[PDB]
Design a protein around this ligand. Structure first.
Ligand SMILES: NC(=O)C1=CN([C@@H]2O[C@H](COP(=O)(O)OP(=O)(O)OC[C@@H]3O[C@@H](n4cnc5c(N)ncnc54)[C@H](OP(=O)(O)O)[C@@H]3O)[C@@H](O)[C@H]2O)C=CC1
Ligand SMILES: Nc1nc2c(ncn2[C@@H]2O[C@H](COP(=O)(O)OP(=O)(O)O)[C@@H](O)[C@H]2O)c(=O)[nH]1
Length: 321
């Protein structure tokens, strides 16, 4: 029972790897070459030594092919990506190559070497961007609002196309924002909790955010990776929206974070235009009805609980510096 997880050093890769290991999977994690060790998330989950690392890059089709061949995975989870919207306008090509073509690279590796391996594409609610429905489900028309959303949209559709064109068991998980103590510092939730922690510990004096009016459906990565796995356990591949069904403004989330340490965010929050987006996704609100009905998946961790554990995690990290 082998699984190839790209983006294994990322937030989801860590939680998914952990989940896969508990299920007896030999977990192969595709790791891009970095100048320094980037496996802290895997160590945080205590599974860094339980993964068979595959040296490769999503932009290098050959290395992706090689990793698939070496892993002989029954399941492939494509979590590798330039996953930050905030960087997609600066590097729209790498975003498209990695998040879009990278999917094709994996699908091709699968199609040409082991068409039976099940594939999971890490699609995103960002694809709904300018939401065409108050609550977005699998049938809500997509409307990407960033090179990231567009690249992912490509990733989503190419996955669907390979499923439909070759009968590949390829599924696109349209996951809405999910955070955790492993959430990248680039994302608003981790940025906030990290700031709250440093502010609380007197190592920081302010928190600079952009659009605090943006509404996000935030879930726990730990819960979401379960949906990914469940998706690949289905006999027939399909796409599913995975979300909490609850959307919150960055402001309130920010308030939740500071309040958790007895602070008033208003005392440190500073709106900085440098963090505004060229084309904003004002609100995301997912409808995971299909996932609950078919996968039996449902979110367990609420935003409050999520922010709490993140703040706690960052308080521990900051206090250890
Ligand atoms: N988290 C969310 O809220 C949402 C995320 N997603 C998507 O699901 C996936 C997992 O998200 P999450 O864990 O937060 O993402 P992260 O950004 O935390 O981690 C995934 C990344 O993939 C690796 N990666 C990036 N570029 C390449 C490359 N060219 N070749 C190989 N590996 C690469 C990164 O390594 P390195 O760090 O060294 O670059 C890192 O592991 C991503 O595809 C993301 O876009 C979908 C919906 C929502
Ligand atoms: N990353 C980030 N987002 C911010 C910031 N200030 C406000 N936001 C907004 O909060 C939302 C969530 O951003 P992010 O966590 O990056 O996830 P996204 O949903 O993938 O864009 C968006 O609408 C951002 O524009 C900030 O400093 N950083």
């Amino acid at each position: 029972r082998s699984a190839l997880v790209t983006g294994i050093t990322g937030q989801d890769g860590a939680y998914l790897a952990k989940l896969l290991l508990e299920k007896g999977y030999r977990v192969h994690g595709l790791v891009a070459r970095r100048s320094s060790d980037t496996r802290w998330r895997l160590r945080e989950l205590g599974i860094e030594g339980d993964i068979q690392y595959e040296d490769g890059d999503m932009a290098d089709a050959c290395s992706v092919q090689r990793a698939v061949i070496k892993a002989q995975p029954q399941e492939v989870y494509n979590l590798a990506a330039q996953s930050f919207v905030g960087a997609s306008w600066n590097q729209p090509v790498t975003t498209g190559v990695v998040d879009g073509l990278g999917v094709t690279h994996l699908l091709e590796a699968i199609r040409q070497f082991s068409p039976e391996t099940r594939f999971y594409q890490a699609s995103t609610s960002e694809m709904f961007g300018l939401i065409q429905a108050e609550r977005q489900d699998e049938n809500t028309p997509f409307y990407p609002r960033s090179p990231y959303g567009v690249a992912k949209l490509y990733g989503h559709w190419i996955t669907v196309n390979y499923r439909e064109s070759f009968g590949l068991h390829a599924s696109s998980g349209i996951l809405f924002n999910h955070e955790s103590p492993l959430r990248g510092i680039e994302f608003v939730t981790r940025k906030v909790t990290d700031a709250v922690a440093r502010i609380k510990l007197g190592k920081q004096q302010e928190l600079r955010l952009g659009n605090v009016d943006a509404k996000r459906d935030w879930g726990f990565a730990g819960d979401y990776v379960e949906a990914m796995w469940l998706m690949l356990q289905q006999d027939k591949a399909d796409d599913y929206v995975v979300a909490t069904g609850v959307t919150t403004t960055v402001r309130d989330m920010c308030q939740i974070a500071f309040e958790h340490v007895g602070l008033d965010y208003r005392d440190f929050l500073k709106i900085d235009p440098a963090f505004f987006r060229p084309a904003e996704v004002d609100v995301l609100l997912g409808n995971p009805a299909k996932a609950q009905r078919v996968l039996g998946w449902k979110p367990r961790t609420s935003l409050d609980e999520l922010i709490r554990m993140m703040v706690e995690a960052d308080l521990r990290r900051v206090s250890r510096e």
